[PDB]
């Protein structure tokens, strides 16, 4: 009934004593010699179709009927009747059938695994990755800041930064190609960005050069090439573009108020353009920010849609087959309060006082505030000029974050249901929200004012990291310690429906348990192939 | 599906610490003065950051591993280039192993519940709230009179 | 000539019973023995409270 | 008045294992896997896996 996701998370996890688990996440935890045992008849009773997640539901009226929602990808086949070794071997079939070429090695996957298992990740990296909103010119103004950040994180700790957000990855790949960043540090980002191109090449090679009508068949065979799948974070407007390029019916539920047409764009979206293109309304947007009822703002303050040559696929590949396997799904949605983090900057002494020279370090003359502890726990020495440039991204910065429930139709060969309500698939997209690695208590004690945990996905809803970010779910996984499983963690009902979801528990247990290597990335890409007859045709051909 | 974050070098250097007759007793008096408190550890951060950097750059071994809270605090704090590059990684690996073994024991116990509580206290004897760690600094004693 | 397996899971019908876990009958058989053990230890049987 | 071995959790089999085992990953895994109880539902969770 509202925009604000902090109260959405808080009213679910306040006094949560009953922690019930889904039946698709219950079977997911069994082996195949135990699933077919006659004691688990209450889970074998509704496993009677390889494509459909039949559930009885609840006796709402007098007599309740069963509902069958599609298992879209082959990854949603359960761990009993499709184990992790089977998908890991299908990945090695897929790697030689489509002739995939791994550009990364175990070194790159190791240095990406050592960041999500690092509790010493600087929270200053989250505030620069939050003050940039996937914008290009916001990254141009912070080239010395991030060239200080990645170098100070690579020389000291050996890991590479900003690897949670694809936008920072591609901005580092194109802008930081000089000798600003280090050689091997840039090499790791180059490998990370090249493997998504290679996996998109292999998915295009599996999809083939066959077209249905005028459109290709690649949206009918895989889910990563499907334009009706959205990446979990939408920093710019990929929603109106989804309304344009869809032959099916997207029904974007932006705070209990849907919209299914492009003529209703400014009724539901407000484009945040460039900095010079908003200079005639800086004070208007700030008055809408400071003075405004943001609680019920059914408007998205999104950026403009840039149209990169790869349509939407490298975002989906990075967020679905690279990060949920390199990190073992140890991430959660990091909703940022944006007026509280730019109150932290543009304050505290030298950011407001211009008496200091612009190339002097801030930490020897920073008062005892939340910015000084934000750089004390991280041990980086930025100048005052980069912090002034980073605070300067506040007039065109959006006010809050909010999650939005995109409810697109199923594929045309997956729309055979009797009811029209389970002919659809849902996808919660975190608008202007980050994704986070593991927090410490020293980080949570000083960034409780800035960020808040949003468990909203299967790979981005880990309670091993949300309990380090939200104190009210840490008592949830103290009371019920079985909720620490990524497949069985309770997520908010307004924020994540399991049965109506692209990636269910079956893929959440492959993500959270596989060893991070090349065979796991190829196995996760090869379990994104749909259970559609065009996928059967394009798999029999290879 | 356990994943060891610890290699053989970390175990072979923890065994190097434990078989050291010349282990400094000053690292016992520092842990005695702190005794597992978070407020007392941040007073002595420029003390322990010199301690475990002269023990590392002197002998190759890592200090304070004889007590859990004294390396939990080194996992939280002291990653801000206070310790050396290859010495903080050993404490981080020792702390990450315990989370990996906790996840493995939780996956062993499963996602089934009896009554209203879990079966982690019933399957294993490490997920049992009744068993206490052998070294107490804070109050873990009023707690098991309320939850058990 | 079918190859039926015998898991641990089939033996749970007898390994989960409160007769396999009670010591009452073995102690009833040992306390009623006509010739018990001659070497008694009393080293750490019971805690003494200081 | 400090340690009565019969009324304990970890007994002489545990110390006899830990004093002889070579310190590696298989010993850490064996010590983690010998802390499982002997409940009926400790055998249920070992029959499932």
């Amino acid at each position: 009934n509202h925009m604000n996701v902090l109260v959405i998370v808080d009213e679910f996890y306040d006094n949560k004593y009953a922690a019930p688990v889904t039946d698709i996440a219950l079977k997911c935890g069994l082996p195949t010699e135990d699933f077919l045992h006659p004691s688990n008849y209450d889970l074998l009773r509704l496993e009677l179709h390889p494509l459909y997640d039949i559930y009885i539901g609840r006796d709402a009226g007098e007599r309740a009927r069963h509902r069958a929602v599609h298992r879209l990808m082959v990854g949603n086949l359960p761990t009993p009747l499709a184990p992790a070794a089977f998908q890991e071997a299908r990945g090695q079939q897929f790697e030689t059938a489509t002739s995939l070429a791994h550009v990364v090695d175990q070194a790159v996957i190791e240095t990406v695994q050592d960041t999500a298992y690092d509790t010493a990740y600087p929270a200053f990296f989250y505030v620069v990755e939050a003050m940039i909103h996937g914008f290009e010119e916001k990254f141009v103004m912070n080239v010395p800041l991030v060239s200080l950040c990645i170098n100070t994180y690579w020389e000291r700790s050996g890991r590479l930064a900003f690897v949670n957000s694809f936008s920072m990855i591609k901005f580092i790949c194109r802008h930081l190609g000089n000798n600003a960043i280090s050689k091997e540090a840039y090499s790791m980002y180059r490998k990370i960005y090249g493997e998504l191109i290679a996996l998109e090449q292999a998915l295009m090679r599996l999809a083939g050069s066959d077209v249905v009508g005028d459109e290709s068949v690649g949206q009918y065979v895989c889910a990563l090439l499907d334009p009706n799948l959205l990446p979990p974070v939408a920093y710019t407007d990929i929603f109106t573009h989804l309304l344009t390029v869809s032959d099916r019916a997207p029904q974007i539920i932006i705070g209990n108020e849907v919209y299914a047409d492009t003529l209703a764009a400014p009724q539901f979206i407000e484009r945040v353009g460039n900095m010079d293109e908003m200079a005639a309304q800086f004070v208007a947007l700030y008055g809408y920010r400071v003075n405004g009822d943001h609680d019920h703002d059914f408007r998205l303050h999104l950026g403009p849609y840039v149209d990169e040559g790869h349509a939407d696929v490298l975002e989906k590949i990075f967020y679905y087959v690279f990060l949920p396997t390199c990190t073992n799904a140890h991430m959660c949605g990091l909703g940022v309060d944006f007026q509280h983090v730019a109150q932290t900057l543009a304050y505290n002494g030298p950011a407001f006082s211009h008496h200091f020279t612009r190339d002097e370090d801030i930490l020897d003359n920073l008062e005892n505030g939340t910015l000084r502890d934000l750089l004390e726990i991280s041990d980086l020495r930025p100048t005052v000029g980069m912090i002034r440039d980073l605070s300067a991204s506040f007039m065109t910065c959006p006010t809050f974050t909010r999650a939005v429930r995109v409810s697109v139709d199923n594929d045309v060969t997956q729309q055979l249901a009797p009811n029209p309500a389970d002919k659809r698939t849902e996808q919660t997209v975190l608008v202007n929200g980050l994704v986070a690695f593991a927090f410490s208590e020293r980080t949570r004690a000083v960034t409780q004012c800035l960020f808040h945990a949003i468990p909203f996905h299967m790979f981005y809803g880990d309670p091993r990291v949300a309990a380090t970010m939200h104190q009210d779910v840490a008592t949830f996984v103290m009371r019920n310690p079985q909720q620490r499983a990524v497949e069985a963690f309770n997520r908010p009902e307004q924020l994540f429906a399991e049965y109506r979801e692209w990636h269910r528990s079956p893929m959440g247990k492959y993500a959270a348990e596989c060893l991070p290597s090349l065979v796991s990335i190829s196995g996760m890409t090869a379990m994104h192939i749909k259970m559609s007859p065009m996928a059967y045709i394009a798999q029999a051909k290879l | 599906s356990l994943a060891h974050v610890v290699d053989q070098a970390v175990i072979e250097t923890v065994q190097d610490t434990a078989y050291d007759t010349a282990y400094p007793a000053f690292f016992y008096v520092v842990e005695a003065m702190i005794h597992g408190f978070e407020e007392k550890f941040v007073m002595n951060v420029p003390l322990v950051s010199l301690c475990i950097n002269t023990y590392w750059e002197r002998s190759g071994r890592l200090a304070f591993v004889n007590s859990f809270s004294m390396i939990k605090f080194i996992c939280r704090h002291l990653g801000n280039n206070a310790i050396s590059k290859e010495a903080y990684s050993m404490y981080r690996k020792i702390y990450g192993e315990l989370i990996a073994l906790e996840q493995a024991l939780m996956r062993l116990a499963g996602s089934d519940v009896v009554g209203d509580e879990s079966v982690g206290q019933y399957v294993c004897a490490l997920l049992d709230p009744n068993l206490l760690p052998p070294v107490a600094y804070t109050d873990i004693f009023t707690h098991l009179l309320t939850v058990s | 000539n079918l190859l039926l397996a015998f898991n641990l899971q089939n033996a749970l019908k007898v390994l989960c019973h409160p007769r396999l876990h009670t010591p009452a009958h073995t102690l009833n058989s040992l306390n009623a023995a006509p010739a018990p053990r001659d070497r008694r230890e009393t080293y750490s049987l019971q805690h003494r409270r200081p | 008045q400090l340690f009565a071995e019969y009324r304990e959790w970890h007994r002489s089999p545990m110390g006899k294992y830990a004093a002889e085992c070579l310190p590696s990953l298989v010993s850490i895994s064996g010590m983690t896997a010998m802390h499982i109880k002997m409940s009926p539902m400790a055998y249920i969770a070992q029959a499932k896996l």
Binding site: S39 | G115, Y122 | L12, K13 | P40, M41, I44
Partner: peptide, 20 residues
């Protein structure tokens, strides 16, 4: 009783009788 009816349900409660 929860433990008793969990144990009794998770295990089950000419076939040759085959004891252990």
């Amino acid at each position: 009783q929860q433990v008793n009816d969990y144990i009794k349900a998770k295990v089950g409660a000419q076939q040759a009788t085959c004891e252990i």
